Design an enzyme around this catalytic site. Structure first.
Site, PDB file in Angstrom:
ATOM      1  N   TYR A  26      35.072  42.886  36.125  1.00  0.00           N
ATOM      2  CA  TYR A  26      35.598  44.281  36.287  1.00  0.00           C
ATOM      3  C   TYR A  26      36.666  44.677  35.279  1.00  0.00           C
ATOM      4  O   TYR A  26      37.156  43.896  34.491  1.00  0.00           O
ATOM      5  CB  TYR A  26      36.175  44.396  37.658  1.00  0.00           C
ATOM      6  CG  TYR A  26      37.330  43.405  37.773  1.00  0.00           C
ATOM      7  CD1 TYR A  26      37.049  42.098  38.082  1.00  0.00           C
ATOM      8  CD2 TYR A  26      38.644  43.785  37.573  1.00  0.00           C
ATOM      9  CE1 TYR A  26      38.058  41.175  38.194  1.00  0.00           C
ATOM     10  CE2 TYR A  26      39.661  42.856  37.685  1.00  0.00           C
ATOM     11  CZ  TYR A  26      39.374  41.543  37.998  1.00  0.00           C
ATOM     12  OH  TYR A  26      40.386  40.613  38.113  1.00  0.00           O
ATOM     13  N   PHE A  36      45.947  47.384  34.265  1.00  0.00           N
ATOM     14  CA  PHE A  36      46.937  46.497  34.939  1.00  0.00           C
ATOM     15  C   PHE A  36      46.218  45.199  35.304  1.00  0.00           C
ATOM     16  O   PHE A  36      46.780  44.124  35.229  1.00  0.00           O
ATOM     17  CB  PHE A  36      47.475  47.234  36.205  1.00  0.00           C
ATOM     18  CG  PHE A  36      46.427  47.311  37.338  1.00  0.00           C
ATOM     19  CD1 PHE A  36      45.229  47.993  37.175  1.00  0.00           C
ATOM     20  CD2 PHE A  36      46.657  46.682  38.551  1.00  0.00           C
ATOM     21  CE1 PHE A  36      44.294  48.032  38.194  1.00  0.00           C
ATOM     22  CE2 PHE A  36      45.730  46.728  39.552  1.00  0.00           C
ATOM     23  CZ  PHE A  36      44.550  47.393  39.381  1.00  0.00           C
ATOM     24  N   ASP A  37      44.976  45.342  35.696  1.00  0.00           N
ATOM     25  CA  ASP A  37      44.144  44.148  36.089  1.00  0.00           C
ATOM     26  C   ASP A  37      42.709  44.223  35.566  1.00  0.00           C
ATOM     27  O   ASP A  37      41.842  44.764  36.223  1.00  0.00           O
ATOM     28  CB  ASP A  37      44.102  44.023  37.621  1.00  0.00           C
ATOM     29  CG  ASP A  37      45.463  43.526  38.119  1.00  0.00           C
ATOM     30  OD1 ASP A  37      45.880  42.507  37.593  1.00  0.00           O
ATOM     31  OD2 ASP A  37      46.004  44.182  38.992  1.00  0.00           O
ATOM     32  N   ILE A  56      42.261  41.750  47.316  1.00  0.00           N
ATOM     33  CA  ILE A  56      42.693  42.820  48.258  1.00  0.00           C
ATOM     34  C   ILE A  56      41.484  43.268  49.080  1.00  0.00           C
ATOM     35  O   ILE A  56      40.383  42.805  48.855  1.00  0.00           O
ATOM     36  CB  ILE A  56      43.271  43.980  47.436  1.00  0.00           C
ATOM     37  CG1 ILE A  56      42.244  44.305  46.325  1.00  0.00           C
ATOM     38  CG2 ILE A  56      44.617  43.493  46.845  1.00  0.00           C
ATOM     39  CD1 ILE A  56      42.625  45.566  45.550  1.00  0.00           C
ATOM     40  N   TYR A  82      47.653  46.994  47.616  1.00  0.00           N
ATOM     41  CA  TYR A  82      48.846  46.133  47.845  1.00  0.00           C
ATOM     42  C   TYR A  82      49.838  46.989  48.634  1.00  0.00           C
ATOM     43  O   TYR A  82      50.871  47.369  48.121  1.00  0.00           O
ATOM     44  CB  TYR A  82      49.426  45.745  46.499  1.00  0.00           C
ATOM     45  CG  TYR A  82      48.393  45.042  45.594  1.00  0.00           C
ATOM     46  CD1 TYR A  82      47.997  43.745  45.876  1.00  0.00           C
ATOM     47  CD2 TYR A  82      47.865  45.671  44.472  1.00  0.00           C
ATOM     48  CE1 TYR A  82      47.102  43.083  45.060  1.00  0.00           C
ATOM     49  CE2 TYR A  82      46.970  44.997  43.657  1.00  0.00           C
ATOM     50  CZ  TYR A  82      46.584  43.705  43.944  1.00  0.00           C
ATOM     51  OH  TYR A  82      45.689  43.045  43.126  1.00  0.00           O
ATOM     52  N   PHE A  99      38.892  50.395  40.235  1.00  0.00           N
ATOM     53  CA  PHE A  99      38.164  49.281  39.547  1.00  0.00           C
ATOM     54  C   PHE A  99      36.766  49.766  39.136  1.00  0.00           C
ATOM     55  O   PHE A  99      36.227  50.698  39.695  1.00  0.00           O
ATOM     56  CB  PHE A  99      37.970  48.081  40.479  1.00  0.00           C
ATOM     57  CG  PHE A  99      39.266  47.293  40.698  1.00  0.00           C
ATOM     58  CD1 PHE A  99      40.263  47.812  41.479  1.00  0.00           C
ATOM     59  CD2 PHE A  99      39.434  46.046  40.127  1.00  0.00           C
ATOM     60  CE1 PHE A  99      41.418  47.089  41.696  1.00  0.00           C
ATOM     61  CE2 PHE A  99      40.584  45.317  40.339  1.00  0.00           C
ATOM     62  CZ  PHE A  99      41.584  45.845  41.130  1.00  0.00           C
TER      63      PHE A  99
END
EC number: 5.2.1.8
Length: 107
Positions: A26, A36-37, A56, A82, A99
């Site tokens: 992803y 960020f991710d 998550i 989160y 995502f």
């Protein structure tokens, strides 16, 4: 809580199961800021298990809901991301995550 907006459907009959690992790749972005991710991992994407809560919820619920060979754009809201206390620098408070996941296969 979380939404699943598909782009490239998959078979529609094979999903992750209880006792399997999901092999996903992803790209994580934020409403309108930056990444960020992301999963721009050299050789191995990301791999997790269902029923252990390693990722998550937005994912767990989201990714599950996806099928082997399907790709989508999921929208996760605080409740599923989160909560309210994530981390100052990556995940500011109330920071809806977005995502672009591709469930590749199970292992």
């Amino acid at each position: 809580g979380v939404q699943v907006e598909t782009i490239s459907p998959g078979d529609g009959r094979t999903f992750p199961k209880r006792g399997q690992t999901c092999v996903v790749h992803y790209t994580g972005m934020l409403e309108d800021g930056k990444k960020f991710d992301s999963s721009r991992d050299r050789n191995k994407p990301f791999k997790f298990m269902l029923g252990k809560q390693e990722v998550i919820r937005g994912w767990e619920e989201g990714v599950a809901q996806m099928s082997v060979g399907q790709r989508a754009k999921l929208t996760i809201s605080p409740d599923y991301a989160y909560g309210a206390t994530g981390h100052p620098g990556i995940i500011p408070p109330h920071a809806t995550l977005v995502f672009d996941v591709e469930l590749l296969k199970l292992e």
